[PDB]
Amino acid sequence: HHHHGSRFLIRLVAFKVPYNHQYYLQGLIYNAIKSSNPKLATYLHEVKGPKLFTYSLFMAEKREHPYFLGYKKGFFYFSTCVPEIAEALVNGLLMNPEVRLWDERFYLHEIKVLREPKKFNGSTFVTLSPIAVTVVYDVPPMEKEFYSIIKDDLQDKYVMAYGDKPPSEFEMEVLIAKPKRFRIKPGIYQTAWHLVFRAYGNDDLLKVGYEVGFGEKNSLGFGMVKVEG
RNA sequence: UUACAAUAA
């Protein structure tokens, strides 16, 4: 135990934000992990494969679209099942910034520690960060196997976290599905999916996807989802 | 805490 898990909402303080901005969010996250735990930080890069943390997009208190607008504060979410990944993103964001992203200045306001709904099976999930699943293009939800991949990754992420035989009951049904393409530097096409869906299965199974993510790029800001209730 | 993204390989 182990199994308790963690989720964070961080809040910063008229400003601007881009799209395709999740490589720059890769910056503020590792910066504060090195600034706390320098061995943990370097480790994660070369140490490779799906990491046990994920984080949301950078949203605002409002969305405006002529980059785009900005207003009263702004924020994002972070979830990981590895206690130190979080302790080093809480500690490093604390004794530090002063945060400045791209070049926009900002000042740390609060870090609100959310809760884990113990409700998972059947609950509705909406993507906080889009979803990518890649194979050799990026398979969309109309694809029969988008589901075998997304499931499997979670079964592994499961034992990766639980050190135990993976739970085998997972289905997901998708209501709203939105396409999009991102620039991960310099030269790549990641076709992700903004999603709303119902997912039933082993409770703990989906607990994981909740925390670490759904799909591949969890360390780049894909695959983080929220519960509706 | 927002079913909240402009671009389309």
Q: Which of A84, A102, A119 is the last residue of a domain?
A: A119
Give the experimental resolution in Å. Answer: 3.1
Q: What does chain A look like in DSSP terms, one character per residue?
A: --TT-EEEEEEE----B-SS-TTTHHHHHHHHHHTT-HHHHHHHHHS-S--SEEE---B-SS-----B---S-EEEEEEESSHHHHHHHHHHHHSS---B-SS-B--EEEEEE----S--TT-EEEESS-B--B---B--TTSTTHHHHHHHHHHHHHHHHH-SPPP--EEEEEEEEEEEEEEETTTEEEEEEEEEEEEEE-HHHHHHHHHT-SSS-GGGT-S-EEEE-
Note whether A124 and A65 are same-domain residues: no
Sign of the C-alpha dihedral computed for residues A112, A195, A138 and A145 taken in this order: positive
Note whether A3 and A87 are same-domain residues: yes
Cα–Cα dist A23/A44, whole Å: 15
Query: Among residues A127, A121, A116, A100, which one has the least CA distance to residue A27?
Result: A100
Are the beta carbons of A133 and A150 closer than 8 angstroms? yes
Note whether A184 and A215 are same-domain residues: yes
Cis peptide before A173 (omega within 30 of 0): no
Note whether A141 and A215 are same-domain residues: yes
- How buried is A220 (Cβ within 10 angstroms: 0-12 exposed, 13-18 middle, 19+ buried)? buried
Per-residue HEC secondary structure of A135-191 comes to: CCCECCCCCCCHHHHHHHHHHHHHHHHHCCCCCCCEEEEEEEEEEEEEEECCCEEEE
Q: Which of A119, A143, A170 is the last residue of a domain?
A: A119
Sequence letter at residue A113: V
Sign of the C-alpha dihedral computed for residues A155, A158, A160 and A163 taken in this order: negative
Residue with tokens 């799906």: A50
Sequence letter at residue A213: G
Note whether A130 and A83 are same-domain residues: no
The gap between A44 CA and B4 C1' (Å) is 30
Are the beta carbons of A154 and A214 closer than 8 angstroms? yes
Task: Count the neighbouring beta carbons within 10 Å of the beta carbon of residue A58.
Answer: 20
What's the total number of domains in chain A?
A: 2
Note whether A100 and A206 are same-domain residues: no
Note whether A69 and A160 are same-domain residues: no
Note whether A2 and A114 are same-domain residues: yes
Note whether A24 and A57 are same-domain residues: yes
CATH value at residue A92: 3.30.70.1890
The approach used to solve this structure was X-ray
Cα–Cα dist A13/A204, whole Å: 35
Residue with tokens 């992420």: A157
Residue A166 Cα distances to A2, A81, A96, A208, A213, angstroms = 16, 16, 39, 12, 16
Note whether A154 and A220 are same-domain residues: yes
Are the beta carbons of A104 and A18 closer than 8 angstroms? no
Catalytic residue among A3, A19, A43, A45: A45
Q: What residues are paired with A127 via a beta bridge?
A: A225
The verdict on whether A30 is a catalytic residue reads yes
Note whether A146 and A215 are same-domain residues: yes
CATH value at residue A192: 3.30.70.1900
| Nucleotide with C1' nearest the A179 CA | B8
Q: What are the phi and psi torsion angles at A47 (to 5°)?
A: -55, 130
Note whether A168 and A218 are same-domain residues: yes
Q: Which residue is nearest to nucleotide B4 (CA to C1')?
A: A63
How many residues does the structure list for chain A? 229
Cα–Cα dist A79/A9, whole Å: 9
Q: Which of A94, A119, A144 is the last residue of a domain?
A: A119
Q: Which residue is nearest to nucleotide B9 (CA to C1')?
A: A189
Domain, as residue range, for A92? 1-119
Sequence letter at residue A110: E
